[PDB]
Design a protein around this ligand. Structure first.
Ligand SMILES: NC(=O)C1=CN([C@@H]2O[C@H](COP(=O)(O)OP(=O)(O)OC[C@H]3O[C@@H](n4cnc5c(N)ncnc54)[C@@H](OP(=O)(O)O)[C@@H]3O)[C@@H](O)[C@H]2O)C=CC1
Ligand SMILES: NC(=O)C1=CN([C@@H]2O[C@H](COP(=O)(O)OP(=O)(O)OC[C@H]3O[C@@H](n4cnc5c(N)ncnc54)[C@H](OP(=O)(O)O)[C@@H]3O)[C@@H](O)[C@H]2O)C=CC1
Ligand SMILES: NC(=O)C1=CN([C@@H]2O[C@H](COP(=O)(O)OP(=O)(O)OC[C@H]3O[C@H](n4cnc5c(N)ncnc54)[C@@H](OP(=O)(O)O)[C@@H]3O)[C@@H](O)[C@H]2O)C=CC1
Ligand SMILES: NC(=O)C1=CN([C@@H]2O[C@H](COP(=O)(O)OP(=O)(O)OC[C@H]3O[C@H](n4cnc5c(N)ncnc54)[C@@H](OP(=O)(O)O)[C@@H]3O)[C@@H](O)[C@H]2O)C=CC1
Ligand SMILES: [Zn+2]
Ligand SMILES: [Zn+2]
Ligand SMILES: [Zn+2]
Ligand SMILES: [Zn+2]
Lengths: 351, 351, 351, 351
């Protein structure tokens, strides 16, 4: 079997690996459409995961089931499915506590291109098919469906953790794919004023489409001061961190009102720590709560998000800017994510 | 001054009273636009409230401040304001416990036409102006603004008490003005499938506009069976009670699944009591939570909802079907809320 | 093997049955100590559950592991174990939604004596050993340990659902074993004044020991009037329903304050419906929330409650009033729960 | 009138002030018993809360009403009362939002020795008597009653914000007065294992009395490694920060499990920021929530805590180690808080 893998730190190329076997409760799937992610780039060129030798990359896909284990009861070869990027082991004490994302370990719910070969191969492995897969509606465009697996679930989780009320004012820092879904999520929770922060034109138009009432360019002046001008020195009720450096935490604390909430969905990968400004945090007594976490996965989450798309609660087509046709294009696509052209949001490869 | 009032149970009439005087923290306001509510019909022609002696009616209005006490600091004579139907006494133990709606007594937060002279007069009295009033936006249409004072705040409250999740299925029983706002609120909390119950043609079209994906007519058969057929026998996640008789409670319990929530915003003005079906309620162990409460009021609630309108999160114009001009039309308007002509939702009298 | 079973509605007797076999993830356990429950009396004599035939009874036990499947990793033959009355199927959609108690159906988390052969037999089956068992501490008395499997988990759950604030006034209707654990749980959540309702002397003493500050006898007149006089006409903050007929719901509604919460842990197995008094419920606008649910189970719940006992947070010995030695005493012990002698609370049979 | 005040940074001494006069809703009270706080030390000798001049210190007291405004209805001259350290302005928007502690500004609910003359004077002013005072029980020792005003409300708030589960493992960093009430509060919320961190002998014994199951000291090396050895390398469910430097946030993050909560009640007096270790915080994706807030106040809170003491839920006498007689001893008492003698916890001065 051939697939696109990380040969080592800073090196990637096509390799030959043996096709994975399926256990009694597993399923083997072949990709129909895939999409490169920002995290893939960070593991290869930044060593954000350690040293990996010959590991196939990727964690965002939709495909066809080609083989199932003896105990699989809800799926069979031929089924077209949506695969959530987070596929946890449902039999754990962490699950009994209410935290699927950390089943058997911190972030252990994230398997593809971490401690298991990714989806950028002729075939890939899915653990516990009945608990980690959802059926793909026949009339749903493949491009749009791939956006559910990670972008939609991550951004919407940001709005959920933020505990938004009807009429609350919100600020979203970073307007890339994840940030754009954070804006959409906030509107879908009843937010009044929504302020997006970014600079790339293509992202700015998308931000307004999803619900942004105000746009701020961080390169044109201290972002905190800009927020105060807009709110007449009052601040905002909630803040969502979706992009930028570790210093965005300090900015968030300075703009939120006493009693407000800060929600992080950005994976920080540089430096030794993040800092909380003491005075602005009311010396630790201003009731300014800080939250953050990996997107939830599994079958239920996938089906609920799918239905929202079916009932037109959100239009996912705006996130996809580049579409390719043919297995070999997986290479050209990942390269596109590395160079970050100004006209790019997300790219999908249809096999 | 003159004012339309309830002389006694089943008797209405115009009486001559002394113009109200404001205390140190109060304000006297003259109405600009008002609207009749079905709640007053219950209290008067069915004595659902009790026996009253010469009490002026009405609780939904937009007006102009005329006089203020020596201690009022944020409002002055000539200001245009939005008056919330619930005007709590903020200096009470109930407020300290977190329940403004019951300051100094069960339902006491709501004063107009409950036990205090209402808005259907040349002038009326508002307690604690600085804590219970909100400025009316310059470009905002009067008819629309009146819908915030009661309909919007009650409907959204139903969606808030329901604790809706992203992708949850919801059923709204009763599609009158209040129910329509319940549908709009549910969509704005992330609901997936939304099923509306009613029959009036004008109310049905409005329901779809606000977000309903399915419509059911209770006259065609038992609604529980209808819902089960639509959901292949699964039932729904949430239920909002916005209309009908006491028997609607039993229906909600039967259609909601284990662990779901039932939210009541309907004002039951008759009957000795409501029933909960033992078997369907899982003998009291199915985790089917039942909630119910009076709509929130005060300045903050008014400002937060106002801003949602300003940011186009919801279009209130679809609620106003009838508009009159001239103070004397008040009596005629209140009668319509009793007659209920098939093409009516809410009516406003612009003075 | 033999086991004490329900032959049919109003029928009890010992039967001969085949010893259960274990699957790859199961375990076969032999009982060391068991206890009878009032729920079994509702099932057998009240038929409040449906029809059953030759179903072994009992759901409260501690035992020894005899055999385990090939995939069981944390348990082996020879281990002493605490078995929760609720043993869910962790691989289900209800679990993904946060309601283990209803995995694969309403109340489906509770299997023993509900629809699966109970613990009153020479051996019994436990589904998913690693996920549904807990090790019994070396020096823990068998009689005390049994109280954890149901009484402790149910009573505490009533206090948990009540969302008690520090200093809240509480009324516990019914002072049997479940109500006694409800009083203890309420105290362990920060309650101030705790009023218990009952009559049996032995229970009255236990109520005081667990935290009750006031005791009221329901056979002395209108219980609501009694409560009002004690509270100078103010009412109480919370109410936990743990005993009595369906009319206790009306009483709870009348004595609870607007904005309060009513928590039901009483398994109602008689009648058609429970009544909610219209006027006292503020016509459905008093924010008087009503909850009710089955007790949680699984390995995590058992281990957590176990540790609470080990750290002396609660003394379970006061619940066990009768102790027998020998399998044959199961029949007599169960009958006691039907007739209820004046000096009984709970009984345990050690094999 | 005379009082003990802060002359300037690092300066303390008695001065003369005009006798405070009451407004319509206010009351003038003379102290009967008071106590010094570590907060006062951070303001005077650390210039934490900016620079103050001639401000009377103190915020913990019990006293007698000597004068009331024309509008006061529940309190009269001669009444003995309990005064909560937090006395919020109930007519504010923050109160409408559910945050009394920040009425009219960040931390503005706390007035005494923050920006208003404290209780260390012959007479002091209490805003809104009917909403901010509680009657002192006839037979309640003055020393005990003063511990309600701040220590009890603060420690218990740490437990409340921590959202403790029945059986949760908890670690309390800092075992002084506040940390002691933190341990007591956690037990009254159902905690199982409670590990305290401190070394002072008198505190170590009081900690065990309140509920601590394990005690750790810094001499043994890395506090994290110690916690890991005790927990088999698993960590704990919750962490309450009650004392120590800002580096304790880092320790809390490293010892808490993914999905846990960190609760801060420690008033951090110096430093630019608090540091969060990137890797241990799971790059901000491990769901480790961070909270922190000022203690609640007002009439309801005071009465509720008062009743918890009346019903013997907590014994406050263990906090008072030093008792002085005569107004003049305030200076000596306040100095002890700075010196920190090995046998001190709290000191009370009776007039
Ligand atoms: N006190 C306060 O501040 C306020 C309280 N409330 C209360 O909320 C409630 C809703 O008022 P409103 O919106 O004016 O209601 P309406 O009287 O206009 O009727 C609402 C709906 O109930 C339906 N309905 C009738 N019978 C049934 C049935 N048997 N089964 C299912 N549905 C049925 C409808 O059917 P159809 O289409 O046939 O008419 C109609 O769409 C009222 O009781 C009101 O007092 C609302 C606002 C304020
Ligand atoms: N399915 C499950 O897993 C379980 C369900 N449950 C359920 O919870 C409930 C409680 O069980 P248990 O504690 O064993 O009950 P008991 O049979 O011991 O009775 C408890 C109390 O109810 C009383 N009572 C009777 N009538 C009234 C009344 N009119 N008003 C007030 N109190 C009254 C008592 O009075 P007196 O003092 O005179 O007897 C007694 O104090 C039962 O339904 C049981 O099935 C409990 C455990 C498990
Ligand atoms: N592990 C998982 O399963 C996943 C984790 N995540 C994580 O969430 C995060 C967001 O990813 P993605 O949406 O692809 O983001 P992008 O890389 O496209 O960038 C988003 C934003 O960051 C910007 N930015 C840079 N500096 C600042 C600044 N100083 N202030 C404000 N904004 C700034 C933007 O400006 P400009 O317009 O100039 O670029 C841009 O709008 C990433 O860390 C990602 O790994 C996301 C998906 C999956
Ligand atoms: N503003 C308000 O209304 C109030 C604010 N607060 C605040 O809460 C916080 C606590 O006061 P309180 O508990 O009375 O204070 P204390 O000064 O008595 O000290 C408490 C603990 O801190 C210790 N300690 C020192 N360094 C460390 C460390 N590095 N790690 C762990 N523990 C350490 C202790 O050790 P040892 O045992 O060796 O002494 C002691 O047990 C203070 O900042 C205070 O201002 C409290 C009340 C009111
Ligand atoms: Zn991704
Ligand atoms: Zn109304
Ligand atoms: Zn039972
Ligand atoms: Zn203090």
């Amino acid at each position: 079997m051939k697939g696109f893998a990380m040969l080592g730190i800073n090196k990637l190329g096509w390799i030959e690996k043996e096709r994975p076997v399926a256990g009694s409760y597993d399923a083997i799937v072949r990709p129909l459409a895939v999409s490169p992610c920002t995290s893939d780039i960070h593991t290869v060129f930044e060593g954000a995961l350690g040293d990996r030798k010959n590991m196939i990359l990727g964690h965002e896909a939709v495909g066809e089931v080609v083989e199932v284990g003896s105990e699989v009861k809800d799926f069979k070869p031929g089924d077209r499915v949506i695969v959530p990027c987070t596929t946890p082991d449902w039999r754990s004490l962490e699950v009994q506590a209410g935290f699927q994302q950390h089943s058997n370990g911190m972030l252990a719910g994230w398997k593809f291109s971490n401690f298991k070969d990714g989806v950028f191969g002729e075939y890939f492995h899915v653990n516990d098919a009945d608990m980690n897969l959802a059926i793909l509606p026949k009339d749903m465009p493949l491009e749009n469906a791939v956006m559910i697996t990670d972008m939609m679930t991550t951004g919407f989780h940001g709005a959920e953790l933020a505990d938004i009320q009807m009429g609350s004012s919100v600020v979203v820092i970073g307007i890339g794919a994840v940030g754009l879904m954070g804006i959409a999520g906030a509107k879908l929770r009843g937010a009044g004023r929504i302020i997006g922060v970014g600079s790339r034109p293509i992202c700015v138009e998308a931000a307004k489409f999803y619900g942004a009432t105000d746009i701020l360019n961080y390169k044109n002046g201290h972002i905190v001061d800009q927020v105060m001008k807009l709110t007449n020195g009052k601040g905002v009720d909630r803040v969502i961190m979706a992009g930028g450096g570790s210093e965005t935490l300090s900015q968030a604390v300075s703009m939120v009102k006493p009693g407000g909430i800060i929600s992080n969905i950005n994976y920080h990968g540089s430096g030794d720590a993040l800092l909380i400004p003491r005075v602005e945090w009311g010396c630790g007594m201003a009731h300014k709560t800080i939250k953050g976490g990996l997107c939830p996965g599994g079958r239920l989450r996938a089906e609920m998000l799918r239905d929202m798309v079916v009932y037109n609660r959100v239009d996912l087509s705006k996130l996809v800017t580049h579409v390719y046709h043919g297995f070999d294009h997986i290479e050209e696509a990942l390269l596109l994510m590395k160079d970050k052209p100004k006209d790019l949001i997300k790219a999908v490869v249809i096999l």
